[PDB]
Amino acid sequence: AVQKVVVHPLVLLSVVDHFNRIGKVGNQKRVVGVLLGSWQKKVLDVSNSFAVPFDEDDKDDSVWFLDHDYLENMYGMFKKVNARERIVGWYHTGPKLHKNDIAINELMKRYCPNSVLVIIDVKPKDLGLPTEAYISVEEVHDDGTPTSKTFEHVTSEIGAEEAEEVGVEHLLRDIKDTTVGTLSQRITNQVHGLKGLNSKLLDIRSYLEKVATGKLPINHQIIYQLQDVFNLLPDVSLQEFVKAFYLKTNDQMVVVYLASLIRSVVALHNLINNKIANRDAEKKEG
Amino acid sequence: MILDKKFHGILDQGEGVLIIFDEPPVDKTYEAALETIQNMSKVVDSLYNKAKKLT
Amino acid sequence: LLKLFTTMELMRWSTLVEDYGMELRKGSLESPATDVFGSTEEGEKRWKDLKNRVVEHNIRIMAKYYTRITMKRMAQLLDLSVDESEAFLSNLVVNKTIFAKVDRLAGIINFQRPKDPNNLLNDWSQKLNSLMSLVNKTTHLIAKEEMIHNLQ
Amino acid sequence: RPANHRQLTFEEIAKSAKITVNEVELLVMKALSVGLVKGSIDEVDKRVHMTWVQPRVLDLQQIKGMKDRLEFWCTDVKSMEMLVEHQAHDILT
């Protein structure tokens, strides 16, 4: 149904406010906020959101506390001031997906339309993208397990339309723009290996742990496609790609001729002014 | 007609083998060679200005 | 109809000879088969151009697969002369066979292995393979990472 | 065999299926007709090149070999990251 979503940083800075208005009490649980957006178009666009007092139990996980009057009053007044945005779903700040999320999401599945779920981290130490759109749809399983709520990962992007780019750029004054060239390219080409190294290294360790020490079926069926796609590149002998290395290396030669020739053109004004300025300033100094 | 370059091909007498091939990237060596020939005059004129100002 | 639908396996028409014969013999259904063969030449054109049409259509089906069926051996399995196979190639030159490769020494044909420009063909294949491995690797990795959360 | 000259010949198919050499073309034609394999072979002399396929049941030697090749890929990407980033961070930053 929905291919991609658009999440503005305003809601995540509202999660910064979720971490600001705590009051130093010692709970810091998965505070659930009422996510708002535009479900009209096929693409989802989050503009702003708000929160609702949400408290769980220490031992029992099935305890969840929501509010209907606060949702209808905040949504009623928010719709009165801005009717272009309506309820879409919710989101929790907890890093782990608990079992009670089917009951928490089930309320906004009954009263509200199909709600999207977003899992983020309480500490911004994760290098990866903090936002993951999880659609709440029921899927048929091939093994015969009963139909239940399944959270499929929907791709997400963090973009601002008109003003939040200006506000973020003015508040930071440290981040740089695209700036195609040497630095913005070589930084990605340096740290990219760590950007994949922390993800893969962080995932395959617990993966290999759950291979031998795993039960409660983790959908082992998708592991066959995992190792299949991993074995779709069986160390090609590079025999056919030699001519492609001749093409890319020939373009490399083109960049060699462009650099040497163009820089040789740049040497004109320098290697002329260095003489005509020094000898004339010297002969005319005294 | 191959000497007239109306199509891609080449004949043979000993074996009679027909080969058809083409070279699409024609606009690379032309622009590169023109940049080399045009830059030759730049470096030579630079050596004329420096050779004039020195000796 | 199911054999003529798609994925036409290379089979012998001798099994269809008795099927068409009994198709002319039985009168319970499709009775006007003798009316199909009413004219002395029209039915012969429908039959010769019918077997020709399927013996070209199966070539158009196996032409999608690059398995290199080695039509020199296929002419032996079909039990027919190579001259009318050259006439079949005379039907392919008007059937747009321009994307093919022949051999002077041998008789094996090639429906693939073009000049293969690395900036277009290997570019496309490497794009779909590498990118497909990247995003496909991206989906089930974190998806399974969410599947293992329910075990706690 | 995931790697190390995956390319094969019809001798193993005809030997394992006790079928003649005349029916292997119909056998691979049926294999491509089912849709579980996309293998297209550009061979001249009889050869069997295969492509993407799904086990769909189980493979423990491919789980252990999956850990071997996976750890090898991970330590090679890590080795290239430390190698390039080692002096690259010191000269460019």
Is residue C113 within 8 angstroms of chain B, CB to CB? Answer: no
Q: Please state, in angstroms and rounded to a whole number, the distance separating the CA atoms of residues D59 and D52.
A: 16
Q: Do C115 and B21 touch (CB under 8 A)?
A: yes
Contact state of A229 with C139 under an 8 Å Cβ cutoff: no
Closest CA to A6 of A163, A156, A162, A164: A156
* Residue A210 touches chain C, beta carbons under 8 Å: yes
Three-state secondary structure of chain A: CCCEEEECHHHHHHHHHHCCCCCCCCCCCCCEEEEEEECCCCCEEECCEEECCCCCCCCCCCCCCCCCHHHHHHHHHHHHHCCCCEEEEEEECCCCCCCCHHHHHHHHHHCCCCCEEEECCCCCCCCCCCCCEEEEEECCCCCCCCCCEEEEEEEEEECCCCCHHHHHHHHHCCCCCCCCCCHHHHHHHHHHHHHHHHHHHHHHHHHHHHHHCCCCCCCCHHHHHHHHHHCCCCCCCCCCCHHHHHHHHHHHHHHHHHHHHHHHHHHHHHHHHHHHHHHHHHHCCC
Nearest beta carbon to residue A219 from set C119, C132, C147: C147
Q: Angle at CA A37, nearest 5°, toward A34 and A43?
A: 135
Q: Which chain C residue lies closest to D39 (C-alpha atoms)? A: C67
Does C64 reach chain A within 8 Å, measured CB to CB?
Answer: no
Chain D: which residues have CB within 8 Å of chain C? 22, 25-26, 28-30, 32-33, 39-44
Is D54 within 8 Å of A228 when comparing Cβ atoms?
Answer: yes
| Whole-number Å distance between alpha carbons of A62 and A54 | 13
Backbone angles phi, psi at D8, to 5 degrees: -135, -170
Q: Sheet of A49-51: strands edge to edge?
A: A49-51, A32-37, A86-92
Residue C36, judged by CB atoms within 10 A of its CB (0-12, 13-18, 19+), counts as middle
Q: Are A164 and A10 in contact (CB under 8 A)?
A: yes
Residue A252 tokens, joined:
């490399």
Question: Which of D6, D42, D49, D74 is the mutation pick for testing A, counting most A CBs within 10 A?
Answer: D74
Among A254, A267, A268, beta carbon nearest to B28: A254
Q: Which residues from D are below 8 Å from A190, CB to CB?
A: 84-85, 88-89, 92
Burial of A228 (0-12, 13-18, 19+ CB in 10 A): middle
CB C104 to CB B21 under 8 A? no
Q: Are chains C and D in contact at 3+ CB pairs closer than 8 Å?
A: yes
Q: DSSP string of C32-99?
A: THHHHT-STTHHHHHHHHHHHHHHHHHHHHHTTS-S---HHHHHHHTT--HHHHHHHHHHHTTTT--S
The residues, ordered by sequence, that sit 6+ positions from D80 with a Cβ below 8 Å of its Cβ are A193
CA distance A138 to A151: 8
Cβ-nearest to D2 among A191, A204, A234: A234
CB nearest to C141's CB, from A203, A219, A232:
A203
Q: Which contiguous run of DSSP H or E holds residue C144? A: helix C121-147
Q: How far is CA A74 from the centre of its chain?
A: 28
For A124, the token pair is: 């911004």
Under DSSP, the state recorded for D6 is -
**In the block, residue with structure tokens 């719709």:** A79
| Cα dist from C63 to C7, C86, C103, D49, whole Å | 11, 16, 17, 18
Breaks (C-N over 2.5 A) in chain D follow: none
Q: In this structure, how many other beta carbons lie within 10 angstroms of the beta carbon of residue C88? A: 19
Residues of C in contact with D33 (CB under 8 A): 7, 9
C10 to D40: CB separation less than 8 angstroms, yes or no: no
Site of tokens 């003489």: A275
Identify residue D16 by its one-letter amino acid code: S
Nearest to A204 by CA among D59, D51, D61, D77: D77
**B33 to chain A: closest CA residue:** A257
Structure tokens at A195: 């950007």
Residue A86 pairs with which residues in a beta bridge?
A: A37
Burial of D19 by CB count in 10 Å (0-12 exposed, 13-18 middle, 19+ buried)?
Answer: middle
State the nearest Cα–Cα gap between C86 and chain B, in angstroms.
19
Q: For residue B51, report the phi and psi dihedrals to the nearest 5 degrees.
A: -65, -30
**Cross-chain Cβ contact C104/B16 below 8 Å:** yes
CB contact under 8 A, C139 and A233: no
CA C39 to chain centroid: 32
Angstrom distances, CA of residue C115 to CA of A83, A238, D60: 60, 17, 42
**DSSP secondary structure letter of residue B9:** -
**Inter-residue contact D73 to C137 (CB < 8 Å):** no
β-strand partners of A154:
A133
Tokens of residue C41, six digits = 């030449």
User: CA dist C143 to A102, A135, A224, Å?
Assistant: 17, 12, 14
Angular region, B25: left φ>0, alpha ψ -120 to 50, beta rest:
beta
Q: What is the distance between the alpha carbons of residues A96 and B43, in angstroms, rounded to a whole number?
A: 67
Instruction: Name every chain D residue with its beta carbon within 8 A of the beta carbon of C69.
Output: 25
Asked if residue C116 lies in contact with residue C122, where contact means CB atoms within 8 angstroms, the answer is: yes
Nearest to A56 by CA among A94, A13, A1, A109: A94
Quick one: closest CA in D to A235, which residue? D3
End-to-end CA distance of chain C: 56
Q: Determine how many CB atoms are found less than 10 A away from the CB of residue A124.
A: 12
Radius of gyration of chain C (CA): 24
Method used to solve the structure:
cryo-EM
**Cα Rg for chain A, rounded, in angstroms?**
28
The pairing of strands A44-46 and A116-118 is: unpaired
Burial of A33 (0-12, 13-18, 19+ CB in 10 A): buried
DSSP, residue by residue, D29-80: HHHHHHTS-------SSS-B--------S--SHHHHHHHHHHHHHHHHHHHH
The residue of chain B with its CA nearest to that of C117 is: B24
Pairing of strands A4-7, A149-158: parallel
Q: Which residues of A touch C141 (CB under 8 A)?
A: 199, 203, 226
Residues 6+ apart with CB under 8 A from C25: none
Give, as one character, the DSSP assignment of residue C6: S
Assess contact for D48 and D10: CB atoms under 8 A: yes
Contact (CB<8Å) A271/B36: no
CB A133 within 8 A of CB A155: yes
